[PDB]
Symmetry: D2
Subunit: 483 residues, 4 copies
């Protein structure tokens, strides 16, 4: 398998390629051509030009219909997309079929639809000569949108950014994670076979620092950079676009909490926290790495969760009943294992997991870890405050509502929080006090694509979703007519 | 006159003071205590703590009423505010009476009202279990807003930021320009007398680099930095807050064009470009420093505008018939004159002005320049491309509508544009193709405070005004209830 | 006390007058001049001409200022409006001071503010020739608004309609209930003193059929009729305006249910039903005259409610601890007691009340009844299905959630419902299935003036409140510009 | 046996049938089964029950997808719908192919998409106890929507009502005009084949008074009546639903003006008024039957219009170059001719037309009239004030802007107006002064489905389109949660 860049409607190679590795078994899936600076520049110049081409003559209806045809194109090759994402990431085949690929199709459909329904504002005003004036606003393409996406939900997160960008009439230069370039390379083919005009969508492969990522980010021809990934990388990008005062949208790290109150459905909460901690092998920005449980139910909670955690089938993506795949890479497994060790040193009681499973097959050449649960760390322990991004959670008891609110908020992160309670007052009283972008009550990672999505503090900047995307990916222009 | 900081409800001095100079005659107005890094810290910490005090517990409608009292308090001392603004900056008294102070009062009233009327969103969704879920959004105080403002329209721009910050329930640490500290200090007196809780509004005086401005900007306790000023300054601030991923809102430099089509009402356009070029002595980010006029009317437009510019009265703030005051400072005048000779060096014809008026009285120790019109520079000339921020405009002919659109857009700035034409289609056709945040047709600087205001490219990022402000100065939070 | 009409900036009498009677003691309070058909004509014509005068030239901001001036005027005569409302209706002074008069003031201010903040819409479209077109909407005054209000909440409901009418720039001909004429007449005094131009606000007194009310609805010069009152009267007015196709907005009767689930806070629910059945002596359209309580707590609820209802103080408006004044009039009391008898005929257990209290003072000549609770009627009983509009509820057990939802919805009315439950899911699940315009959970008649307000089925048509009032009281006009 | 009713999922006949006549030649096209009171009852009960079936359980996304399938179903049978529409109406085949059928399809698609994008509101408030409350709104199906549609744009208008009715989750009982029942009959087959559940969409045929229309209108089981047609019929319908207080939405007659100012593009304006007077043979509610032209261009305008009008090809729907078909029926033709005669009695000059063309073939048996232009009537002539609904316009000169605005607004109708001018100020200054729901500038009948559509005065009640339809076809419910 080989992965090429897609630039101005042509698939091209580079002066250097790098390896894409199947994390299940450590085998090489493909060679990926790393776009160099010159190739990045040629991508940005083509996107700039495509704005003055036929793409720019498209009506909002026709533009939307072509976008639906992109979505149709994915559905047409659906099983191939499942396969690509699995290969790259080792995610359960089932998860890719029901979450990753359908969501990516919905991303285009939703923004196409929004592109047709969205309108702007009329403001009337009086003037000293008694004739008055009109102010109306319009949404225009921002211009060239730089897209840099991570490896955890590769197609889902890539299209979450590309779909609104294109729905708003922009052109795109997009750099998917080095770890998961396949689904995106397939998307490039779909764009091509859909008739998407050359230069409208450009795919560049490579890494971050000193590679395609950084180059995109320093290129003066882009109008915006929308980014999803590590919080320190966001800060880096922010400095990098700062001289050109580019528009920026960041969705970054979390150290998310789940809170289980004494009046929760205990069974539901054990299940809910199971999913929030070990979905995608804990490799979601939204996962609950910290969990607080009311003292009256703490032991029974931990017991129930240890049990459910131990039932999880960690194995082949297509293995019957498989709940967990491996981590994305060996690099990332090193990091996580380091935290596993650090938790021990920090005084943690390992309730379950804490190492790597043994398969006695090619999987031992992969990057699996076990779902871990910890107990017994203080609120200041590095393991409770820093993002690990593995299938792991620490559980602590609490006694008071105000106490636990304060403990959830005592963080430099503020992405999401899940709350469990059956009490109507509590649910609304507590939810509005959590200093994050996203609260779920009695569920987790339930997504309505119209809602504003984003974090506070280190967890991000800006919001995406619904009109928040329609606004971010557009110039808002105000036009004032004296009458 | 002594100008103290206002921190945690107390007026305080500092170890170091600096001079506030009247640009009309170079006289010392006041001494201003420069807040040090320790005092900046006190203000932020106080602002943080105010959030958990009585301020935090006010209903939206009680907050709004208090903000109307701030407005009332300014009205009550209207002429003192007029005097302070005039003293600092040399602006004609009439301008201070009609634009400057009324707008600061209106800023507070407009946003107090929006605080009461604004609401958020409800999203219903289906779930696999058929029970559905509810997503609702809420606006909360973002936290501590750092405000840093420029000297050209001091109280107007200061309150443009402080009013929505307070209306959204934030607490504020605000640093007005070192050239224009007086109206902000009077505002702190109004806040005090109005009973605004201590720590809610904090005034820190000083400079930018290695001073109060930079310290505010580096403090980890702020939640956002909103800034109006030079574009390179914006970049610096953006770099400075990057490690903290602070929300940012910037309104930056411009090199705005006016365009006069052959079907313009010629006299209205002459008068209009007069205003857009020389209002506030050209020290408005909105001012037209480039002007394009159709060939068939170029000569007559130029001659008309010359006569009108030479009729402008340049003088004392309360002189009879005065149109223009000085520039803000000797420092700024040096920069402006430097461009004036650059224009000669680049080959411009000086239609008028191009120097300093001679008064033969105390005003000669002030910072006056002449209103200045150039002709004959190419589009690449630095004087046509770089923001001067003085009372100057270069005028150039054009023949074709597309050509002029391209000439207007061929800029690293994109703040505003003014267009003159009596043609219905033209006004809408052309306006939408100008790459700026703000277009005016047959007028200029006519403001409805509900409109989004801001720039593209180097002229800013984000928008303010109406709901754009209400969204920027608020945490937007999505709460999702599984049913 | 003399109550005159106010037509075209003047107070005028009429050829016929009728008695305003204090329901506390049956005493004469005022003579009220009944406008005849000629006078209603005079009012409408003056209102038509007012739209062409100075009122029509006001900016939105100026119009809003003046309406705030109306609200200042009522505040400055606060206690006079209290006394006027109390004399007409017998309502407790505290209720007048806390709900009635303050809401009338807040109605004016809320819509004044909405007049300032409200804006309209901009829709861009493609055209076959490629040049495109734009559609913008504006709100204009509808024209002359005919207002007809009831006696149960005289000034609150009168101003609920008059405030948005005026705020949207219309002119008004308004006819308060013949039973409660006084506060509306003081309002005409405030309008006059505040310098509202003549013809903008016209007050006409009288009855329905063959009097001022009917003449209003029949007049071709009005543009809309907004009405609050009995459902059958809504129907008559709908027929009356049909030939003119006048805009209509109706808030009508109800037979509202309250539902107490097993998981309810029982003491709170008992207090809340006490309030929802007997506030204003049950003479609120939102009152709960049907109550359903889970069988498991039915006996305990009914006992608790009996105790609380029997502690209600029935007496003078300023009597210490007073909970209930009299009914509006002897005629209304006749209706209510005839229902008290009917309930017994239909087989009800009279839990408490069911007659008139004996005072041994002037109150015996008034129109008092006792607060009254019934048990043991079928869902088909007339007393359980017909609106009584007095201080009464019937309580009935239920077993199942779907059952009680069907029972509540089983009605020709659908104004409001109140639900008691501490369970998060139940609150949202059940609320969305009640076929009414207004649900409260764990409270009753809590009003945010921005929300849509109205009923379904016989309880109304249209909604008012927030932008719904702003839309109803305005012509919405679409203007399409081919570019 | 040709055109059957469609009730609870079955095509059924009726006791009595009536003739459908082709207006090209007076021949029988089909027999139509007239639904009786019993069958109208069955349809309404079945629609009531369908709300409780699976249609009731569809998610908003599935409901939308299903509506897109109805649309696909029409597209699949495109030319069959074209032929049915042409057969009933005589409309040119090109008009059917480009306007009628595509618009019908776009109706279903636009509202399906709005169903998925539309959201509601969240309002936060403070309370006495310091805990606060939430108010949130939801859109629910109104219930059974009764649709009564006219014959002039049969499928377009029928689906303009049925699409948002179905998109908001309602069920429908719809009665197309006796004159044009074929396309609606095919639509029922498309619903059937798409698997729309039984009772969700019901088609009943017949007349107004004493037939299916009147019966639908009086049935206690509908929740709303949306109607398009003559004003007097709107009035009758308004009275009929009055006892039930059913929600109503009316788009009624007009007597629309076009205004041509001296600075218009004269050739565009002639073309423009030629389209607005004579499209669909003047059988559009939006047609200009009154035309006002500035005296300086009056004779030239009239001369130009005459030439263009006499170039119109009046004939067969498939006739090479055809512009206009017949009127809908003999009875309508008699009406129009009656006006043609009345116009002469009122002293008009017949610039062109005024009678029936002599074809010397089977068209002479159809219902054709000539396109007609009058001059010389007074503003009070019946022919200038009463809607004729034929291919005719009267043209009158004017001198002053305020004069022509008054004469335009001097009407009991107020549906639409067209203005021709190239002047920027005039366009916006004049458009806002015309008392109609819809204004076009330099065009006519250009429709964006998002925009509010409706009239003032006799021309209608309420607005449809965009969110206006989503609100009318829904219950709006406010739910308030005490916290
Ligand atoms: N876009 C707008 O709406 C708008 C409005 C007014 C002025 N401006 C721009 O402002 C400029 C002229 O005004 P100016 O001289 O006051 O701008 P400026 O950049 O010189 O300074 C503005 C403010 O920033 C502070 N500051 C300077 N350096 C700083 C630093 N390193 N860190 C933190 N704070 C710092 C200053 O003390 C001052 O308060 C022009 O470019 C003009 O277009 C823009
Ligand atoms: N405002 C708009 O959007 C619009 C659009 C198209 C046409 N129209 C109007 O349609 C009119 C032409 O309508 P028409 O000639 O179809 O006659 P019509 O308006 O009387 O009939 C229209 C529909 O109403 C039904 N109907 C008639 N009388 C009824 C009754 N008493 N009860 C219940 N239903 C009844 C008919 O059977 C038919 O289906 C013109 O006034 C024209 O302006 C308005
Ligand atoms: C973080 O890893 C999760 C992000 C999810 C979204 O961006 C999404 O569901 O759209
Ligand atoms: C009147 O004949 C025309 C009505 C048109 C519409 O209602 C529409 O285009 O939606
Ligand atoms: Na990998
Ligand atoms: Na100074
Ligand atoms: Na009375
Ligand atoms: Na026919």
């Amino acid at each position: 398998s080989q992965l090429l860049n897609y630039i101005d409607g042509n698939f091209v190679t580079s002066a250097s390629s790098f390896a894409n590795i199947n994390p299940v078994n450590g085998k090489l899936i493909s060679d990926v051509f790393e776009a160099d600076a010159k190739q990045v520049n040629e991508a940005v110049v083509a996107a700039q030009n495509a704005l003055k081409g036929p793409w720019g003559k498209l009506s909002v209806q026709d533009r939307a219909a072509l976008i639906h045809k992109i979505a149709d194109g994915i559905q047409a090759r659906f099983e191939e997309f499942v396969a690509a994402e699995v290969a790259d990431t080792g995610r359960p085949v089932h998860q890719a079929r029901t979450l990753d690929i359908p969501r990516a199709i919905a991303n285009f459909r939703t923004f196409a639809d929004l592109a047709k329904t969205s309108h702007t504002d009329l403001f009337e005003m009086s003037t000293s000569d008694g004739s008055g004036a009109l102010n109306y606003t319009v949404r225009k393409p921002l211009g060239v949108i730089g897209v840099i996406s991570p490896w955890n939900l590769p197609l889902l997160l890539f299209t979450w950014k590309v779909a609104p960008a294109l729905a708003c009439g922009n052109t795109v230069v997009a750099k998917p994670s080095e770890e998961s370039p396949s689904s995106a390379t397939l998307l490039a083919e779909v764009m091509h076979d859909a008739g998407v005009p050359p230069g409208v969508f450009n795919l560049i492969h490579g890494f971050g620092k000193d590679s395609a990522g950084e180059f995109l980010t320093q290129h003066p021809g882009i109008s915006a950079l929308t980014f999803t990934g590590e919080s320190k990388t966001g800060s880096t990008i922010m400095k990098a676009v700062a001289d050109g005062v580019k528009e920026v949208s960041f969705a970054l790290g979390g150290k998310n909490a789940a809170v289980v109150f004494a009046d929760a459905d205990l069974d539901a909460a054990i299940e809910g926290v199971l999913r929030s901690s070990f979905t995608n092998s804990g490799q979601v920005c939204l996962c609950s790495e910290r969990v607080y449980v009311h003292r009256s139910i703490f032991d029974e909670f931990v017991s129930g969760l240890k049990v459910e955690a131990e039932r999880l089938v960690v194995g082949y993506p297509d293995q019957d009943g498989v709940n967990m795949g491996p981590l994305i890479s060996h690099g990332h497994r090193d990091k996580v294992l380091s935290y596993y060790r650090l938790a021990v040193d920090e005084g943690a009681t390992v309730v379950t997991g804490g190492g790597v499973p043994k398969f006695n097959d090619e999987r031992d050449q992969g990057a699996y870890v076990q779902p871990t649960i910890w107990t017994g760390l203080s609120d200041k322990a590095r393991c409770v405050t820093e993002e690990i991004f593995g299938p792991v959670c620490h559980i602590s008891p609490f006694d008071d509502e105000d106490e636990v609110i304060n403990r959830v908020n005592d963080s430099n992160y503020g992405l999401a929080c899940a709350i469990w309670t059956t009490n109507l007052s509590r649910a609304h009283r507590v939810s509005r006090q959590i200093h994050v972008g996203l609260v779920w009550v009695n569920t987790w990672y339930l997504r309505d694509l119209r809602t504003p999505f984003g974090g506070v503090k280190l967890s991000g900047l800006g919001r995406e979703g619904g009109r928040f995307s329609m606004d971010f990916y557009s110039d808002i222009a105000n036009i004032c007519i004296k009458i």
